[PDB]
Design an enzyme around this catalytic site. Structure first.
Site, PDB file in Angstrom:
ATOM      1  N   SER A 111       0.996  -1.535  -0.266  1.00  0.00           N
ATOM      2  CA  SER A 111      -0.288   0.312  -0.317  1.00  0.00           C
ATOM      3  C   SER A 111       0.544   1.032   0.352  1.00  0.00           C
ATOM      4  CB  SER A 111      -1.549  -0.137   1.135  1.00  0.00           C
ATOM      5  OG  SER A 111      -0.307   0.416   2.386  1.00  0.00           O
ATOM      6  N   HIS A 164       2.422   5.673   4.549  1.00  0.00           N
ATOM      7  CA  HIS A 164       1.142   5.962   3.395  1.00  0.00           C
ATOM      8  C   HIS A 164       1.647   7.575   2.511  1.00  0.00           C
ATOM      9  CE1 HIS A 164      -1.079   2.670   4.371  1.00  0.00           C
ATOM     10  NE2 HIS A 164      -0.674   1.970   4.223  1.00  0.00           N
TER      11      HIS A 164
END
Length: 182
Positions: A111, A164
């Site tokens: 991710s 992220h």
């Protein structure tokens, strides 16, 4: 017109790994593929990358690989294998590093790399549409929803928000740099 070798190998590896985790359990697999979680492990160099290969639910792998296929596959066909390889390696290490820093070495999945690919593809299109590379309106929306789910922890994605962003930032930097040419 299909998925190139980098695109395809990563998907295969993630699958094979996910199967290995279904059979041996997650822990046994982490023991071998996770970020060095002990000083004795700090020179097993595959570990700084192989954390990206492990997924913990079906949601997690399914969505990461959809994005990877679509975006990583676009980058590979229109821009090249080497580019995808680099984006992936850098986004993997950085997001890995930040995750690890704030929350310990027990994490995994692609991710971080997907945030890099989202930021890269969106900003290349914004700054340099003639590259062939851009995020479609509809998809910006689905990307954004996917980001929200993770930011507000509506669905379990292993990695935290700071990791992220690290990933996103890398993709932004590279698109920036790339579009600086012309």
């Amino acid at each position: 017109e299909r998925a190139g070798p980098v695109t395809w190998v990563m998907m295969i590896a993630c699958v094979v790994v996910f199967i290995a985790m279904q059979i041996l359990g997650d822990q046994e697999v982490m023991l071998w593929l996770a970020w060095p979680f002990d000083p004795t492990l700090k020179f097993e160099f595959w570990r700084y990358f192989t954390h990206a290969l492990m997924h913990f639910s079906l949601m997690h792998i399914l969505f990461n690989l959809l994005w990877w296929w679509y975006l990583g596959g676009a980058v590979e066909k229109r821009l090249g294998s080497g580019k995808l390889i680099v984006i992936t390696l850098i986004s993997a290490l950085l997001s890995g590093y930040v995750q690890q820093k704030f929350s310990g070495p027990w994490f995994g999945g692609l991710s971080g790399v997907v945030y890099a690919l989202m930021g890269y593809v969106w900003l290349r299109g914004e700054r340099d549409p003639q590259s062939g590379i851009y995020l479609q309106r509809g998809l910006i929306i689905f990307a954004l929803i996917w980001i929200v789910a993770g930011w507000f922890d509506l669905f379990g994605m292993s990695m935290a928000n700071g990791a992220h962003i690290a990933g996103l930032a890398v993709g932004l930097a590279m698109a920036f740099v790339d579009s600086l040419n012309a």
